[PDB]
Write a protein that binds this DNA or RNA. Sequence first.
DNA 1: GGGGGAAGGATTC
DNA 2: ACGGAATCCTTCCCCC
Length: 341
Amino acid sequence: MIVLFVDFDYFYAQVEEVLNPSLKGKPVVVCVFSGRFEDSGAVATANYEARKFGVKAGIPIVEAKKILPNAVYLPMRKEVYQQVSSRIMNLLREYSEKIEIASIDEAYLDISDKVRDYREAYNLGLEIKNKILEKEKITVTVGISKNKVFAKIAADMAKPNGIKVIDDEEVKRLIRELDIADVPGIGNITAEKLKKLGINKLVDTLSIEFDKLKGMIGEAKARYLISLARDEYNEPIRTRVRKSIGRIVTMKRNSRNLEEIKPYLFRAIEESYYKLDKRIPKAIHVVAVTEDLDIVSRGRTFPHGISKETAYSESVKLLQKILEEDERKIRRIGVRFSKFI
DNA sequence: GGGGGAAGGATTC
DNA sequence: ACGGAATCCTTCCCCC
Ligand SMILES: Cc1cn([C@H]2C[C@H](O)[C@@H](COP(=O)(O)OP(=O)(O)OP(=O)(O)O)O2)c(=O)[nH]c1=O
Ligand SMILES: [Mg+2]
Ligand SMILES: [Mg+2]
Ligand SMILES: [Mg+2]
């Protein structure tokens, strides 16, 4: 089994560069303005010109304008980046019908047939790499190794517009070299608990007691990190399917009043039923961000699909129980739709 | 004990 | 200043 993974580079940012090359060369910050005050909101993603200076996503736009005050600031446009993705994704399937679409900028393959040996994989690299680079004008990093995981680390250590392969011999040198945070599935919150147990490099996950993992990072994670440590891991590529949809609007100003919220909750439903197109959600949730940025949702599954009417009716029933079980005000309010039929 | 779920909060990206 | 989309994990319950 041989895996050729692909990460679309600074995708949102890049797309816009393809939709107006005048940018390709300049710093570019894509961001969702919340509308409250001028330039309020956050960065969605930044290219390497803007990132190479501290501008990354999640950070306030204002802080951004503070570091790079002469960068192009463009609102985000998901739809477009969503199709420029599909046009590309379909352009990968003609390389294996068994590909795994992880994200919008990630696809998983298994050219175990198409390519046995590595140097041979390394070429199916520049050939999938050179083609998506000539059809949609997009440049993407390629990662090659034994499983899906070391495939990310592959593209991770060589992106952007890069390439790298990890001989099975290397999937062994990094098990003891690679920090634990650079491990796919590991985010800061987890890279800590682990450091608190003592762990740092992959391999260190066998030292500590197994019940010492379970309790600190869950067992799914435990078995997960244990596996890769033994070179075993080896998991099958899987077509994968989105199993939830939802929008999360931003209050012009914090609101605790069930009527100032309403107009928002409904922009969220519509902007979910449209994205939902042809999917019947048996379950629905309501997410609401408490002013001091804490989240608190509510839900409810039905024995049948949810008609847009039910979608408002119960939508309002859940927001209320929040405004009730809690007391903070609300900065963000959305709606999740899951468990389709 | 645990399967079959439902829910709300947590963590990743 | 502190968006946004999804899923991952731990918990509670029901009735066998
Ligand atoms: C880490 C992090 C990422 N994100 C968004 C911003 C990053 O661009 C994205 C993760 O990207 P990555 O996949 O980590 O890097 P990338 O270049 O492959 O992604 P992209 O092609 O979009 O640039 O997730 C957040 O919104 N908050 C976060 O804390
Ligand atoms: Mg990407
Ligand atoms: Mg990504
Ligand atoms: Mg990580």
